[PDB]
Every structure is written in structure tokens, then in C-alpha cells.
Design a protein around this ligand. Structure first.
Ligand SMILES: *[C@@H]1O[C@H](CO[C@@H]2O[C@@H](C)[C@@H](O)[C@@H](O)[C@@H]2O)[C@@H](O)[C@H](O)[C@H]1NC(C)=O
Ligand SMILES: *[C@@H]1O[C@H](CO[C@@H]2O[C@@H](C)[C@@H](O)[C@@H](O)[C@@H]2O)[C@@H](O)[C@H](O)[C@H]1NC(C)=O
Ligand SMILES: *[C@@H]1O[C@H](CO)[C@@H](O)[C@H](O)[C@H]1NC(C)=O
Ligand SMILES: *[C@@H]1O[C@H](CO)[C@@H](O)[C@H](O)[C@H]1NC(C)=O
Ligand SMILES: [C-]#N
Ligand SMILES: [C-]#N
Lengths: 162, 162
């Protein structure tokens, strides 16, 4: 299995992601998205793209990406502080169930997987998430994939922020 | 007029704030909330307070506050990185109109105003907002109140983030 042969699942309507807020990452590839919370935001009333935005929040640091749909269930991200573009797909989504929401998304460079984001609001308890992670580990560079929450700072009275 | 005599308006249901996302600050007191975007978030499925959260985002920095209602239309904030508490009120809200949403909120220390946050998603065009700002300037230390967007960094293809 190479990264380009991973499933490219249908991307749910943006409101379903917004209604899943807040999410935490369960499995990631680089260290970047360890101990990170994800927030989806509707487009600004003044946005001329009318692209919604994904926010990745790690303590007091944040990265934001406006994004639009592309071909074959792709998401095309624009990192808001640099203008750099990324192309993302979903392995699966399972949003707004009785046990909350989960998904796994990935970014490829050809046959190699370069980033991986398994997110949930149910502490990783959707069987689909462990299962999708075991599959993504099998593609080239998927050996980097690991648990995102082994060493997170202690809270000071909030739950998705620190 | 002293800060303690400012109106303490009724706080809209949290979903109305969430449906106003994203907001930008129009007038502020300290420099802290210049060029800042505000995002409201529903409580985490795993939160035991079930407090929603306000996020203030200024470039790649973020401060988060879980908050609950208190007496007399107060909001009681818990800053998520420190645990420090703040008590906030609203001068007015005017959310989810045909011209979008606005509000002005403030924090007092007795008769003195110590922070001020006028927010909107309509570029400050609600007549109530200019009007409320002119009133808050009249309370002690309200002379610090100023336009929040005179010198913000340039965008890189997003609209509420930079
Ligand atoms: C959340 O889950 C933690 C342990 O469950 C882990 O599940 C997978 C993802 C592995 O990374 C492995 O570490 C564990 O089997 C708990 O330690 C933690 O207390 C749980 N939190 C709540 C709120 O239940
Ligand atoms: C947004 O508004 C800007 C100027 O309007 C300002 O209104 C008050 C709040 C004062 O601070 C004063 O600077 C101005 O009267 C415009 O420069 C800007 O282009 C406007 N943006 C859009 C998208 O219309
Ligand atoms: C895939 O490989 C690396 C990723 O940084 C780079 O050399 C190359 O530009 C990428 N491919 C394309 C078509 O951009
Ligand atoms: C109001 O004034 C300052 C704010 O930092 C401080 O000395 C004092 O603790 C504040 N009042 C109360 C009751 O905390
Ligand atoms: C991108 N979801
Ligand atoms: C606090 N709104």
C-alpha cells in the first residue's frame, strides 16, 4: 500500500465539522500536531473566497488554514500566515454519531505519507480510528505515525486548551 | 459615569455567539486585543464544567478562556493557560441581524474601566457600536479606548487570520 492508494473518503458538509468542535488529535505523523486541538470556523461575512477555516491550537500557538474542495475528495488548504498550499484527503469520517465524531486525514507526497491527523471528540474510542491508523502505518513513512497525547502539559481549569 | 454604572446587558444564548463566528475587534482598551479575532466554541464532549470557550487569536498567538454565567449578566472567565479569573459584562449585544453581529463588553475594577472589547463581523458598521464606544470613553480610564485595526499585518490569502 502506498499513500496514493489510501481511500479518499467523501468530505462531510462543513457544518458537521463545526458541530463537532472542539476536536483533539489522537494520532499524528510529525511532532507538529501533538497535544493539539482542532476548531472549524465558518467563513467570515467579509471573506471573498467564502472558504471556511481549520484552526490548529497547541497551547498558546495557533496555525490557521482557509480551505476549499478540490478534485476527488481533496481539501486545498491555504496556511493563513504564509500563503503556502497543502492538499489533504480523508481516509474516513464518522461525524456526529451517538459516540461523537472522528476522522483520519492525510497528506501525501506521491507514494510517501508526509503528515497524518486522526482527530476525535471521544478520546479515540471509535473503532474505525484505531483501524485506519493501523492501515496508514503500512504505507511508506507511515512508521512515523504515533499517539499524539503521551506528554501534554497540565490543564489550568479548561478541557480542550492549556 | 463610572464603570460600575455601565449597562449590564443580557448575554445571548451561546449558540448565537458561535453562529456569529468569526468576529474581529473594532475598539479595545489595552494593546492586547488589537488586530485580534474572536472565536466562540461549544464545550468539549469531555468537559466536566461544560463551559463554552472564547478564543482570542492575534496572528499565531492565542489565548483561550472557558466561561460561565454569573450574577447580574456577568461572564466569569478562566484563562486556560494560567487559571486566572476575570469578570466581564456586556454594554449591549446586537447579534444575528441582517447586517451581521456586534457587541461591546468591558471589565471593571470598581469605578475604573480596565479592558474594553467591541467586536463585530460587519466591520464596525452597527450604529450601536460607535455609540457604545463614545459612552465607554466617558468612564474613568476610558480615555485609553481606541481603534483596534489601525496597523494590522497584511494577509496571505485568508480573511480573519494572518
Ligand atoms: C483517554 O484515553 C487514555 C488511554 O487510552 C489509550 O488509547 C490509545 C489511543 C493508546 O494511546 C493508549 O495510550 C491507551 O490505550 C486514558 O489514559 C485517559 O485517561 C482517557 N481519558 C478519558 C477522559 O477517559
Ligand atoms: C472597514 O472600515 C475601514 C474604515 O472605517 C473606519 O470606521 C471607524 C471604526 C474608524 O476607525 C475609522 O478609521 C473609519 O471611519 C476601511 O478603511 C476599510 O476599508 C473597511 N473594510 C471593508 C472591508 O469595507
Ligand atoms: C513531492 O516531494 C517533495 C515535497 O517537498 C518536493 O520535492 C516536490 O516538489 C513534491 N512534488 C510536487 C509535484 O510538488
Ligand atoms: C481592583 O484593583 C486592583 C486590580 O488589579 C487590585 O488591587 C484589586 O485586587 C481589585 N479588587 C478586588 C476586589 O480584587
Ligand atoms: C481540512 N479539513
Ligand atoms: C465572554 N463572552
Amino acid at each position: 500500500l502506498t499513500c496514493d492508494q489510501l481511500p479518499k473518503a467523501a468530505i462531510n458538509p462543513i457544518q458537521e465539522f463545526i458541530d463537532s468542535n472542539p476536536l483533539e488529535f489522537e494520532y499524528v505523523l510529525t511532532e507538529t500536531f501533538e497535544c493539539t486541538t482542532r476548531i472549524y470556523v465558518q467563513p467570515a461575512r467579509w471573506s471573498t473566497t467564502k472558504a471556511p477555516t481549520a484552526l490548529d491550537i497547541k497551547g498558546t500557538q495557533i496555525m490557521a488554514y482557509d480551505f476549499v474542495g478540490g478534485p476527488e475528495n481533496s481539501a486545498h488548504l491555504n496556511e493563513c500566515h504564509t500563503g503556502d498550499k497543502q492538499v489533504w484527503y480523508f481516509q474516513y469520517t464518522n461525524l456526529l454519531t451517538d459516540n461523537g465524531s472522528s476522522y483520519c486525514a492525510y497528506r501525501c507526497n506521491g507514494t510517501e505519507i508526509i503528515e497524518y491527523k486522526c482527530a476525535s471528540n471521544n478520546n479515540g474510542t471509535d473503532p474505525l480510528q484505531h483501524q485506519a491508523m493501523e492501515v496508514a502505518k503500512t504505507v511508506p513513512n507511515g512508521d512515523k505515525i504515533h499517539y499524539a497525547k503521551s506528554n501534554c502539559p497540565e490543564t489550568h481549569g479548561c478541557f480542550a486548551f492549556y
